[PDB]
């Protein structure tokens, strides 16, 4: 038994070593992970920002935002690890061979490796967000389905004035989303008004979302939509049970997220809302403009060895554990017998998965026990096509046929000093802009009046330089 410190949190809880799928890996791997981060820290950002100042480093150094892993791999917080790769790693050695367009995802501009990925199975699935309305609630109120945003904006007051789900409360969340911090809150309003609230590419340049006049028509939209009711009024505290809360009351009426897990509402709420329809449309058109900037990239974020571990073979060896046919199995699907069973030497997952008695999303319950919990692993789309609805299914088909979805930008890899200073400016601004936007939407600032000052205020913290940075990595 091996004692392993890791620093490791993902949708805000850190990972208990406890759950199905770890204790597995462990009787395989003989590694006993024990988290740094304790069971009541649910902001991964300033849990790893406090970490970096405890002194020693844990072991395994687990992180959504792999622009500032990768920084502390070059500062030499974390190892090199394409030598113990090569030496120890058979798996990685495999999968970086099979998959270039993966390697470089791992590979720094130094040409170290000093994380690796958790990658996204991209080039079966890379549609992401997609709009979902209640068609339900459209047929009641004998009502199209809107195709535009002002059209969305008519329906959405319709849904908050005329009591489609038929109480006689004015009870209905016409527009909601789902997250865990106020990007991903940012990310799932403003793509309606074809803005981003993150780096985008327009026509071989870089861009910064929240500084375009876009982004700032967005905001004022959404202030408009908060003050009459047509957007949750929760919708930055709600957290990430809003979906599931709002859609089983039947409040929801919109909403923009991830297609499959969203899909799974209909089957899952067909008893307890008898003509529960919330159902996949293209992106609303805006002046013409069919297109979301909501797809999958190839990776989210990524785990490395520190400085400080006694024995990164060991680790290394672990790391590989979860790129073999098993351990990826684990990894994707949970535990057989439990979350599937193989048939024909294929999982197929079991009642407790697909037909929850509690309600649960197929995904929430493979989350549960640690299934696809965001670490370095590789993501096997079989997994999400194992409990898709068919309208998942057709759903990304549906995206992908009609061209709706633009890719997303890669993240940009820097030299040391340029990676630096970047992520110190983008730290910067994101803060900036996190706080403008809920004053702006919330109704506590101005946006017409402060507008002007806030695009100083990126510039004086470096938004020029960002853009050139940026603009030499592509
Ligand atoms: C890597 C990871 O855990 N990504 C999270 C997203 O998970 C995706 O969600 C869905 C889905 O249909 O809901 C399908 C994909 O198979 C799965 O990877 C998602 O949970 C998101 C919510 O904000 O958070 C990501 O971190
Ligand atoms: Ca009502």
Redo the contacts with the bound molecule.
């Keep these: 038994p091996k004692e392993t410190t890791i620093f490791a949190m ?2 805000g809880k850190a990972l208990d070593p406890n759950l199905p799928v770890f204790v597995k890996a462990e009787k395989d791997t003989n590694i006993k992970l024990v988290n740094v981060a304790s069971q009541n820290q649910t902001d991964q950002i300033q849990a790893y920002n406090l970490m970096l100042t405890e002194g020693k480093l844990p072991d395994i150094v687990s992180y ?1 935002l792999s622009a500032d892993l990768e920084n502390l791999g070059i500062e030499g917080g974390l190892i090199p690890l394409e030598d113990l790769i090569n030496q120890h790693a058979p798996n990685l050695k495999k999968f970086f061979e099979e998959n270039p367009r993966y390697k470089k995802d791992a590979v720094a501009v130094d040409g170290h490796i000093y994380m690796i990925p ?1 990658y ?1 199975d991209y080039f079966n ?1 890379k549609v ?1 967000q997609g709009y979902f309305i209640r068609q339900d609630w459209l047929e009641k109120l004998g009502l199209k389905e809107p195709r535009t945003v002002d059209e969305l904006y008519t329906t959405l007051k319709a849904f908050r004035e005329k009591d489609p789900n038929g109480n006689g409360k004015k009870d209905e969340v016409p527009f909601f989303v ?3 911090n106020v990007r ?1 809150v940012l990310t799932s309003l403003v793509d309606l008004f074809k803005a981003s609230p993150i780096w985008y590419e327009e026509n071989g340049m870089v861009k910064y979302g929240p500084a375009q006049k876009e982004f700032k028509h967005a905001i004022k939209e959404l202030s408009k939509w908060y003050k009459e009711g047509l957007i949750d009024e929760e919708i930055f505290t709600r957290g ?1 049970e809003s979906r599931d809360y709002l859609l089983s009351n039947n409040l929801g009426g919109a909403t923009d ?6 899909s799974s509402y209909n089957r899952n709420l067909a008893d307890k809302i008898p003509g529960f329809n919330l159902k996949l449309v293209l992106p609303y058109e805006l002046n013409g403009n069919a297109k979301t900037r909501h797809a999958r990239t190839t990776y ?2 990524g785990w490395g060895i520190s400085k400080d571990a006694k024995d990164p073979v060991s680790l290394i060896k672990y790391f590989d554990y979860w790129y073999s046919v098993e351990g990826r199995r684990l990894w994707n699907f949970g535990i057989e017998g439990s979350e599937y069973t193989l048939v024909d030497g294929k999982p197929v997952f079991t009642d407790k998965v697909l037909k929850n008695p509690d309600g649960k ?1 197929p ?1 929430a319950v493979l989350r549960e026990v640690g299934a ?3 670490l370095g692993a590789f ?1 096997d789309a079989q ?2 096509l194992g409990w ?1 609805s068919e309208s ?1 299914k057709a759903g990304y088909k549906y995206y992908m046929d009609n061209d709706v979805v633009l890719d997303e930008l890669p993240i940009l890899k820097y030299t040391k000093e340029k990676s630096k200073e970047f992520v110190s400016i983008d730290t910067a601004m994101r803060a900036v802009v996190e706080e403008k936007a809920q004053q702006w939407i919330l109704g506590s600032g101005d946006i017409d009046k402060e507008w002007d000052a806030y695009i100083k205020r990126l510039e004086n913290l470096g938004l020029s330089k960002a853009e050139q940075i940026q603009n030499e990595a592509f």
């Design positions: 993902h949708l959504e958790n996204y699935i992401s789902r997250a865990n991903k990430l997220d991830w297609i499959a897990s969203t989210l974020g999303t995904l696809q919990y965001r993501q997994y999400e898709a998942a």
